[PDB]
Amino acid sequence: RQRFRFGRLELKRISGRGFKNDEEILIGNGTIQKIGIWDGEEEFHVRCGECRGILKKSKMKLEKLLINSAKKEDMRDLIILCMVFSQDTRMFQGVRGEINFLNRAGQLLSPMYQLQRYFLNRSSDLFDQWGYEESPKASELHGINESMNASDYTLKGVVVTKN
Numbered sequence: 001r002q003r004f005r006f007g008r009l010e011l012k013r014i015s016g017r018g019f020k021n022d023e024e025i026l027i028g029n030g031t032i033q034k035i036g037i038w039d040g041e042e043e044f045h046v047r048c049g050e051c052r053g054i055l056k057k058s059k060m061k062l063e064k065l066l067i068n069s070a071k072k073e074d075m076r077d078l079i080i081l082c083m084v085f086s087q088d089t090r091m092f093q094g095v096r097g098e099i100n101f102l103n104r105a106g107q108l109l110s111p112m113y114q115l116q117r118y119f120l121n122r123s124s125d126l127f128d129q130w131g132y133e134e135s136p137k138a139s140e141l142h143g144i145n146e147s148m149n150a151s152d153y154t155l156k157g158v159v160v161t162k163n
């Protein structure tokens, strides 16, 4: 179980194993792109800057995201990166603008990496499309909104912890 990188996201496997299969994905801007889709339940230690976390996912779905309280810029980006990495259906739907999977030279670009670059710049569109749910009643767990503040409603699957 090695530490590996997905752009600004650092991961370290806790449990589970994923199997990748190329699938045609209809993303939000109406275009269809072939993307390697991971199948299986996986759990990771995740990090973005000073923000630590635990990510749980299945095939094209973020099951849960446990993050610590830290720098709000790092909390936000970690959530963004984990949403993209999870390959959640809501994340693909959040792509409203144009994404190029080829540069101007005609070279091949990584679809997943391009999605990261896109949503790091378009977080509001992602959060709105992602949806919200009731924050946990538990005292040791709090919800978090689009402004990275403690709220009665939280981003779906995302809870902040300060234990």
Ligand SMILES: Nc1nc2c(ncn2[C@@H]2O[C@H](COP(=O)(O)OP(=O)(O)O)[C@@H](O)[C@H]2O)c(=O)[nH]1
Pocket: 005, 006, 018, 035, 036, 038, 042, 085, 110, 111, 112, 113
């Ligand atoms: N769920 C999961 N994702 C992984 C694993 N290893 C790599 N990835 C992600 O899968 C994506 C690989 O996409 P890419 O680099 O374009 O390779 P490609 O699918 O062959 O085009 C990257 O975003 C990685 O972060 C893994 O073990 N489990």
